[PDB]
Amino acid sequence: IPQTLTNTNLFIDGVSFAGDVPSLTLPKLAVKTEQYRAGGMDAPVSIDMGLEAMEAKFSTNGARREALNFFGLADQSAFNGVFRGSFKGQKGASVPVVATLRGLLKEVDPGDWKAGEKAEFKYAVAVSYYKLEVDGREVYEIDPVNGVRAINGVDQLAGMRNDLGL
């Protein structure tokens, strides 16, 4: 049932970037693993050790102001932004995929201005909070400063929250 992504749009603070954003990138949600090899067994197995540093990145190719004006902002996690993306599907009805991500803008990379090529600024928000929804349905909600890694409702850290006494 071919889905595929058709169109994409990017918010920062309500301000739509319906225009300059030829690339989005959601934070690669990865676990930490640590290949556990130990007594009684050959071949490792790998363990949930917590997630990796979620970093998201978009790249407007316009001097956009509304984006540049969050860089290094004293209040880390002030930059909010929402990465919406419509997946078409061969049968018409498009699936809204939307990923709000309160984080810290971190860095800004304007590449080679060449007087004949889309300048293309770049950005890389060090994501703090991150909720990825599909068809208006929470699939992920990863909150580090709180410990709320919750796959569609069920909170997989509800058991470690207690043992830590949070």
């Binding site: 918010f11 603070d13 309500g14 739509s16 909010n80 929402v82 709000t100 309160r102 909070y129 909150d143 400063v145 709180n146």
Partner: protein, 385 residues
């Protein structure tokens, strides 16, 4: 003249009181006498950051100044004082303190406290009226104002006896009203003798300090009223239910002041007919949580409604709300945009709705130490071993 050197100036400056700076502002309304030095036109809410400003603004020997000192001694907070020129009769005094619109110029009396915001951004979160509070009239005014404000109004009931205090408390049941009965007795160094204060000033001051070094959502129940000595009536407090004077006043929804020489406050409970709002912690949380929300969603109160307006706000709420959870303020929460209300009609007319159901930190109270002096561990020691 301009002296060029280093002036060694011999002058009596009696001991820095010291006070942790707070934030929660205090709407003070007391009496004083406008003299030559006390530069403060009676019904004009002035702002105060230290005792020096209090002095220059009010006669050092004024009831205003006494309350100001009673607050500062605990915490260096921002006060909004209103100098109600000393009237004669109790009726005239009460009326002059309650105030109203009266003089077409400005809102007199306690109503002057509504000018606190827009004047100095000092929207009183804690209303207080020292002494002027035994009078049921002033207290009613405090309650109404306190509602039109969302501010805990700290009353001081009839200092004399307990029967009067209880009878007085039964006249109320208004959520915001939070009473403190035992009139504190502090040793005034000036006259060199035990003064008699109305208690409400010290409660409000400590309220501010509790908001700071503990949290606005932590009760001031067991916290130490800085300064002061005994009360105007020794308050009893023991264990085992009983007729413990404290247990009595804290079953008529009144806070007392217990332990040696006015050690500390005592009573998280508040004057409320409604059991849900029994704890000041509940009320204060429910109020200041929203203060933090609005002071942050300022941007949300205008602006062309876009497709993403509803979401911008429901997420912005989930940000402030989440942060409060992180720092203890609440325990879980739930924000969304109430669908059965959000309509084309309401939206065309600007309006829109959301729910913010959450839970507040229950203040631990009444630890029940059950103890049994047995003879179980007897053989385990002594005999032979």
């Amino acid at each position: 003249s301009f002296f060029h050197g280093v002036t060694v100036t011999n002058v009596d400056i009696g001991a820095r009181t010291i006070a942790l700076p707070a934030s929660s502002v205090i709407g003070l309304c007391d009496v004083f006498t406008p003299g030559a030095q006390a530069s403060a036109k009676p019904n004009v809410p002035v702002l105060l950051t230290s005792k020096k400003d209090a002095a220059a603004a009010f006669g050092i020997g004024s009831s205003i100044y006494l309350a100001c000192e009673a607050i500062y001694n605990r915490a260096q907070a921002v006060i909004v004082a209103v100098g109600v020129e000393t009237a004669e009769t109790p009726e005239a005094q009460a009326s002059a303190v309650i105030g109203g619109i009266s003089a077409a110029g400005e809102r007199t009396g306690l109503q002057a406290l509504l000018d606190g915001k827009s004047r100095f951004n000092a929207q009183p979160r804690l209303l207080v009226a020292p002494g002027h509070s035994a009078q049921q009239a002033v207290a009613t005014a405090m309650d109404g104002l306190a509602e039109k404000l969302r501010a805990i109004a700290i009353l001081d009931g009839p200092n004399s006896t307990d029967e009067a205090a209880v009878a007085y408390a039964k006249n109320f049941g208004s959520k915001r009203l939070f009473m403190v009965d035992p009139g504190v007795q502090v040793w005034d160094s000036a006259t060199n003798a035990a003064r008699n204060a109305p208690a409400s000033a010290y409660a409000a001051g400590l309220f501010a300090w509790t908001d700071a070094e503990y949290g606005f959502w932590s009760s001031p129940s067991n916290k130490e009223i800085k300064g002061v000595t005994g009360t105007s009536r020794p308050v009893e407090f023991l264990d085992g239910d009983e007729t413990c004077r404290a247990n009595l006043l804290n079953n008529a929804n009144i806070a007392t002041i217990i332990r040696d020489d006015g050690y500390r406050l005592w009573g998280n409970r508040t004057l409320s007919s409604d059991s849900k709002w029994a704890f000041v912690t509940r009320v204060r949380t429910m109020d200041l949580v929203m203060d933090a929300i609005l002071a942050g969603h300022k941007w949300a109160v205008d602006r062309g409604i876009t497709k993403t307006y509803v979401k911008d706000v429901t997420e912005g709420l989930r940000a402030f709300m989440r942060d409060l959870k992180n720092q203890g303020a609440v325990i879980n929460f739930e924000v969304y945009a109430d669908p059965d209300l959000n309509s084309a009609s309401q939206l065309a007319q600007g309006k829109v709705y959301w729910n913010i159901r959450f839970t507040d930190v229950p203040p631990a109270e009444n630890p029940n130490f059950r103890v049994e002096v047995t003879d179980q561990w007897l053989t385990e020691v002594l005999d032979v071993a």
